[PDB]
Amino acid sequence: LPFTTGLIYDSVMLKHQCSCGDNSRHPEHAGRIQSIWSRLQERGLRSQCECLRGRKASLEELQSVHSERHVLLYGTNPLSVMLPCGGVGVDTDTIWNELHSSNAARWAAGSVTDLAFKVASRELKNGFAVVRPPGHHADHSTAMGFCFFNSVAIACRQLQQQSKASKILIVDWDVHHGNGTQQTFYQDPSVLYISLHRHDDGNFFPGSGAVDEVGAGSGEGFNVNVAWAGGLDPPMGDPEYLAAFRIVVMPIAREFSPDLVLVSAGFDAAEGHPAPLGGYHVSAKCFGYMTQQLMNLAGGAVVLALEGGHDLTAICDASEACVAALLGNRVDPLSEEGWKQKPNLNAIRSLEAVIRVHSKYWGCMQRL
Ligand SMILES: O=C(NCC1(c2nc(-c3ccccc3)cs2)CCOCC1)c1cccc(-c2noc(C(F)(F)F)n2)c1
Ligand SMILES: [K+]
Ligand SMILES: [K+]
Ligand SMILES: [Zn+2]
Ligand SMILES: [Zn+2]
Numbered sequence: 001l002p003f004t005t006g007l008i009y010d011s012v013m014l015k016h017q018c019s020c021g022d023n024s025r026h027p028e029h030a031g032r033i034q035s036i037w038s039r040l041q042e043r044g045l046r047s048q049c050e051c052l053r054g055r056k057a058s059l060e061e062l063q064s065v066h067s068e069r070h071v072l073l074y075g076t077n078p079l080s081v082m083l084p085c086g087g088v089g090v091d092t093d094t095i096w097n098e099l100h101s102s103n104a105a106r107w108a109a110g111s112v113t114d115l116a117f118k119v120a121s122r123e124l125k126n127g128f129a130v131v132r133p134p135g136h137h138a139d140h141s142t143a144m145g146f147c148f149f150n151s152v153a154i155a156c157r158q159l160q161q162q163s164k165a166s167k168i169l170i171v172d173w174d175v176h177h178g179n180g181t182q183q184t185f186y187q188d189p190s191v192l193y194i195s196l197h198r199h200d201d202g203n204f205f206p207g208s209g210a211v212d213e214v215g216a217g218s219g220e221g222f223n224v225n226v227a228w229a230g231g232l233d234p235p236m237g238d239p240e241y242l243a244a245f246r247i248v249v250m251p252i253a254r255e256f257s258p259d260l261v262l263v264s265a266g267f268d269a270a271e272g273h274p275a276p277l278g279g280y281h282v283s284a285k286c287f288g289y290m291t292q293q294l295m296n297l298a299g300g301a302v303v304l305a306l307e308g309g310h311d312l313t314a315i316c317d318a319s320e321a322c323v324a325a326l327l328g329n330r331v332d333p334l335s336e337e338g339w340k341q342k343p344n345l346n347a348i349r350s351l352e353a354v355i356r357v358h359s360k361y362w363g364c365m366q367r368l
Contacts (some may be wrong), residue, residue: 001050001118001123002126002132003122003123003124003125004048004049004050004053004062004124004125004327005049005050005124005125005126005127005128005132005323005326006049006050006052006115006118006119006126006127006128006167006234007040007046007049007050007051007052007054007068007127007128007129007323008052008054008114008115008127008128008129008130008131009033009037009051009053009054009111009131010053010054010212011102012104012107012251013033013098013104013106013108013132014030014033014034014104014105015029015030015099015103015129016030016097016100016101016104016105016133017029017030017100018083018085018087018095018097018131019086019087019096019097020087021120022085022289026086026132026137026308027254028129028132028133028146028310030132030324031312032306032309032310032312032315033087033131033132033144033306035312035315035316036130036306036315036316036319037130037321038281039040039316039320040319040320043320044223044252044368045320045323045324045327048247048322048327049128049326049327050124050341052111052114052115052118052175053111054110054111054114054115054129054131055107055110055111055114055203056103056107056110057106057107057109057110057113057149057151057154058110059071059075059076059254061108061109061110061113061154061158062075062106062149062154064147064154064157064161065149065153065154065157065184066138066140066141066148066150067140067141069141070140070141070142070143073142074101074102074106074149075102075149076102076149077102078098079350082363083095083285084156084236084254085102086181088199088298089188089308090143090144091144092273092366093145093146094144094145094146094147094148095141101133101148101267102187104132104133104157105133105149105343106149107131108129108131108133108134108148108149108151108239108305109135109154109155110137110330111129111131111151112131112151112152112154112155112303112305113127113154113155113158113326114222115127115129115205115303115305116154116155116156116159116260116262117157117158117159117162117164119260119301119302119303120159120164120165120259120301121164121305122301124301125300125326126295126300126301126303126326127302127303127304127326128265128304128306128319128323128326129151129303129304129305129306130306130319131151131305131306132306133146133147133148133178134146134147134151134266134306134307134308135147135149135150135151135152135153135154135264135305135307136150136152136153136172136174136176136178136179136180136181136264136266136307137150137176137178137180138150139179139180139184139208140181140183140184141179142180142184143223144156144206145176145205146308147180147207149348150169150180150181150184150263151229151305152178152181152195152262152263153170153181153184153185155179155189155262155303156168156170156262156326157184157306159260159329160190160191163261164260165258165301166190166194166259167190167191167256167257167258167259168190168191168192168260168262169191169192169194169253169256169258169261169262169297169298170185170192170194170262170263170264171190171194171195171249171253171261171262171263171264171294172194172195172196172197172259172263172264172266172309173192173196173263173264173265173266173269173281173287173290174197174264174265174266174268174269174307174309175197175198175265175266175268175269175273175277175278175308176197176198176204176205176206176266176268177197177199177206177207177208177209177225177227177305177309178193178195178197178264179193179206179208179209179294181193181195181264181339182195182208182209182213182223182225183278185219185222186212186215186216186219186222186223187215187216187217187218187219188212188222189215189218189219189220189222190299191219191222192222192223192224192252192253192256192258193223193224194224194226194249194253194256195209195224195225195226195227195268196226196228196241196244196249197209197225197226197228197280198228198230198236198280199211199227199228199350199357200224200229200230200231200270201229202229204276205276209225209227210225210227211225211227211350211353212348212357212360213225214357214360215359220361221358221361221362222256222361224248224252224354224358225349225354226244226248226249226350226354227353227354228240228346228347228350229312229344229346229349229350229353230344230345230347230349230350231335231346232275232279232280233278234279234345234346235281235344236269236279236280236282236344236345236346236347237271237280237281237282237283237286237338238283238285238286238336238338238339239279239284239288239338239339239341239342239343239344239347240281240343240347240367241269241290242286242289242339243343243344243347243348243351244327244347244351245293246316247292247351247355248351248354248355248358248365249293250293250296251362251364251365252358252362252365253294253297254297254364255362255363255364257297258297258298259298259301260298260301260302260303261294261297261298261301261302261303262267262303262305263291263294263302263303263304263305264305264307265304265305265307265322266306266307266308267287267306267308267309267314267315267318267319268284268308268309268310269312270282270309270311270314270315270317270318271281271283271285272311272313272314273309273310273314275309277310282318283336284314284317284318284320284321284331285321285325285331285336287318287321287322288320288321288322288324288325288329288331289321289325289331289333290316291304291321291322291325292325292330295325295326302326304322304326306319306320326366355367
């Protein structure tokens with residue numbers, strides 16, 4: 001296998017859809033990964049990468065993060081809740097195809113894991129997983145927010161249990177808080193979880209991920225929530241996220257010094273997502289640049305896994321810029337006006353809260 005960027009995609013994951021067939025009512029649709037996959041070929045990036053199909057996660061791999069009851073319910077064939085539209089699901093948003101959802105969720109978990117091992121073993125330089133359904137909301141014993149199994153958390157656990165990576169950084173720049181990922185690794189100091197999300201004092205899904213939530217026991221200080229407050233006005237975009245990377249994400253990541261970086265790469269903070277889905281204005285160039293910054297860690301061992309993002313144009317633009325970054329294309333910070341603007345007052349106050357809390361744990365957060 002050649003030493004380039006890896007891409008994960010398979011049609012099995014397209015099968016996850018409600019029986020009613022309305023992709024408008026169920027916005028986490030197959031078109032999401034389908035559009036990105038073809039977009040990468042149209043732009044010429046896909047042929048440059050080593051394209052893999054992935055695999056099903058074993059029941060044992062799913063149980064490394066989730067409970068036995070959870071894995072029996074969503075992981076196995078029955079032969080071994082009603083919705084307004086008529087289909088079955090765990091809740092109104094999180095649908096369940098009785099023939100295909102389990103297989104698609106297990107494939108997303110297995111494929112992110114398979115890609116992480118190849119990047120960890122250094123067969124691949126880095127990778128991008130075009131997977132669905134998403135994972136970072138799925139906790140130990142709860143499927144929620146379009147998520148069933150936490151693919152990124154499962155990939156992380158398997159890397160540790162097979163001794164392929166000592167320290168692992170999980171970065172989650174999806175606009176929503178990865179409640180599942182935070183819970184899984186809350187007491188583990190060998191995993192560092194840094195989330196950037198719209199918090200607005202608990203009035204935004206899932207409602208968790210406050211700045212005070214720093215971890216527990218041995219894992220105290222190794223959970224970093226960059227919880228944005230203040231609202232949508234003034235606009236949250238590139239200057240705020242760039243500032244977040246300069247001041248919080250990269251300094252803590254460098255002080256932690258991971259052996260492998262996993263990215264819950266949601267693109268619902270991008271332009272084209274109105275409230276209450278996101279309401280943020282992060283450009284595609286910023287996503288690709290944030291990717292480029294993470295490639296400086298762990299000797300380039302970086303793996304992105306798709307999470308959220310609805311607007312087809314926005315997530316395709318952003319996915320393109322991240323894959324290009326992975327392939328070695330560099331973004332010149334001086335080439336874009338607007339990046340010269342300072343971050344807004346709401347973002348500064350939010351980062352002030354992050355610094356004040358984590359000054360107890362990190363040297364780069366300790367000031368006079
Ligand atoms: O508030 C939410 N959604 C808003 C609505 C939308 N959800 C999406 C959507 C599209 C693709 C993936 C996930 C959500 C578009 S609109 C829900 C019903 O229709 C009107 C607003 C909501 C609630 C729970 C979870 C999420 C959510 N978004 O991304 C993710 C993911 F897990 F990161 F993928 N989860 C979003
Ligand atoms: K997040
Ligand atoms: K942690
Ligand atoms: Zn339906
Ligand atoms: Zn999201």
